[PDB]
Paper text:
Synpcc7942_2462 from the cyanobacteria Synechococcus elongatus PCC 7942 encodes a putative sugar kinase (SePSK), and this kinase contains 426 amino acids. The At2g21370 gene product from Arabidopsis thaliana, xylulose kinase-1 (AtXK-1), whose mature form contains 436 amino acids, is located in the chloroplast (ChloroP 1.1 Server). Domain I exhibits a ribonuclease H-like folding pattern, and is responsible for the substrate binding, while domain II possesses an actin-like ATPase domain that binds cofactor ATP.
A considerable difference is found in the loop3 linking β3 and α4, which is stretched out in the AtXK-1 structure, while in the SePSK structure, it is bent back towards the inner part. The corresponding residues between these two structures (SePSK-Lys35 and AtXK-1-Lys48) have a distance of 15.4 Å. Structural comparison of SePSK and AtXK-1 showed that while the RBL1 binding pocket is conserved, the RBL2 pocket is disrupted in AtXK-1 structure, despite the fact that the residues interacting with RBL2 are highly conserved between the two proteins. In the RBL-SePSK structure, a 2.6 Å hydrogen bond is present between RBL2 and Ser12, while in the AtXK-1 structure this hydrogen bond with the corresponding residue (Ser22) is broken. This break is probably induced by the conformational change of the two β-sheets (β1 and β2), with the result that the linking loop (loop 1) is located further away from the RBL2 binding site.
Author numbering: 11 to 434
């Protein structure tokens, strides 16, 4: 009878999924972020909060009465600064895709070369930028990631984050600590304490049980980032299990017993349980397809493909020059020649070549030290093309299928469940 709520705060709106213990969906829904008042110093944060309340309201009351645990994900490196005593958000959030170049040299002056913080969009660059604006009483401020802040709205215990959200500020999930080069700086006093994703923080606040009818013993758990929640939704849990996201671009994630980080290729690892999620991202993918054909042309041409026969066409499908993974060449040219007169042959060549690139990506992760890929689940638009699925299975020489669930909010609900089970 106990249910488990996960929310996903994405780039333009929030979503929620409520599951039972067996992962069956009892309720789900979405809301776009409302506008905020021009004068609101909170900016987008005020909207996010509104969305939180809206989503909670959207859950059927009979479903809310059964919800035993809550987790949620948010966007990576979306950074808020609060006064520790009042809880006041001291400025507009630093959004996931917002950069603080002004802080990057200082960060490079304390962090290891090619550490993942050494990027203008990193949480740490944002922290250092804010710090250096010398706000009065800044030493009484605290940093929260988007997810941490929304969760804190729910449980009332200030300053807790997770292994995943905290990565871009410099937290090391392997030693479960912030490194001395970070702790040696005064803004380190703003850093949140860090737990594993999907672990209990505290009971849901009485305000929410009173207003929405959640049971008194409902708990609130740490979250994760939306990318990782989305991966979790697939329920790939063993090393060698992989999820390929086939969308506008191509991105892969591979579960591994061994941590892998390599700046040459932009390869980075997050911690999950006792494992490492190793990610890599290519500029190839569906964008060039839809650039070349209509969606109607795409499915109609797809129906004419024999996926069990390989294309002789060697393409590197790109819209413009440049690749970082699985080839580190910022000048890498698109290759779409020769283009056969048959659009079916052309399409087959593109799909097959993207499969080649995907395979090469998994091989590179393996060569960098990851557990070798054994099976590939598929997310993104590309997943609904079964001809492409069969092509990929043949070219990769591995079993390939659709992931069953891919929504971040579904993965967040799995974290809520994990937290409840652990807490029990």
């Amino acid at each position: 009878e106990k249910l488990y709520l996960g929310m996903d705060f994405g780039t333009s709106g929030g979503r929620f999924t409520v599951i039972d213990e067996q992962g069956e969906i009892k309720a789900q829904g979405k809301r776009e972020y409302p506008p905020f008042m021009k004068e609101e110093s909170m900016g987008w944060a005020s909207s996010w909060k509104a969305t939180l309340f809206s989503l909670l309201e959207d859950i059927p009351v009979t479903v809310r009465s059964l919800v035993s645990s809550i987790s949620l994900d948010g966007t990576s490196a979306t950074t808020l600064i609060l006064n520790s005593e009042s809880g006041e958000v001291l400025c507009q959030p630093y959004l996931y895709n917002q950069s603080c170049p002004d802080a990057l040299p200082e960060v490079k002056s304390i962090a290891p070369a090619n550490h993942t913080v050494c990027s203008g969009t990193s949480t740490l660059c944002k922290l250092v930028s804010w710090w250096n604006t010398e706000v009065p009483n800044r030493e009484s401020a605290v940093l929260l990631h988007q997810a941490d802040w929304l969760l804190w709205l729910l449980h009332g215990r200030l300053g807790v984050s997770d292994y995943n959200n905290a990565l871009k500020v410099g937290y090391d999930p392997e030693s479960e600590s912030y490194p001395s080069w970070l702790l040696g700086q005064p803004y380190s006093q703003l850093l949140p304490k860090v737990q594993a994703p999907g672990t209990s923080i505290g009971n849901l606040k009485e305000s929410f049980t009173r207003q929405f009818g959640f049971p008194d013993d409902c708990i609130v758990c740490t979250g994760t980032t939306d990318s990782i929640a989305a991966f979790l939704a697939a329920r790939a849990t063993e090393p060698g299990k992989a999820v390929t996201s086939l969308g506008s671009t191509l991105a892969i994630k591979l579960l591994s017993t061994k941590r892998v980080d390599d700046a040459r290729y932009g390869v980075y690892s997050h911690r999950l349980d006792d494992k490492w999620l190793v990610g890599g991202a290519s500029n190839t993918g569906g964008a060039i397809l839809r650039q070349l054909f209509s969606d109607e042309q795409l499915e109609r041409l797809s129906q004419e493909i024999n996926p069990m026969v390989g294309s002789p066409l060697d393409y590197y499908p790109l819209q413009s020059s440049g690749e970082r993974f699985p080839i580190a060449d910022p000048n890498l040219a698109p290759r779409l020649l020769p283009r056969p007169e048959s659009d079916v042959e052309f399409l087959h060549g593109i799909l097959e070549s993207i499969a080649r690139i995907e395979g090469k990506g998994y091989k590179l992760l393996k060569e960098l030290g990851a557990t070798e890929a054994e099976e590939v689940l598929t997310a993104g638009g590309g997943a609904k093309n079964d001809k492409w699925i069969k092509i990929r299975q043949r070219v990769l020489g591995l079993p390939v299928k659709k992931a069953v669930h891919t929504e971040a909010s579904y993965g967040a609900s799995l974290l809520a469940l994990k937290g409840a089970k652990q807490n029990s």
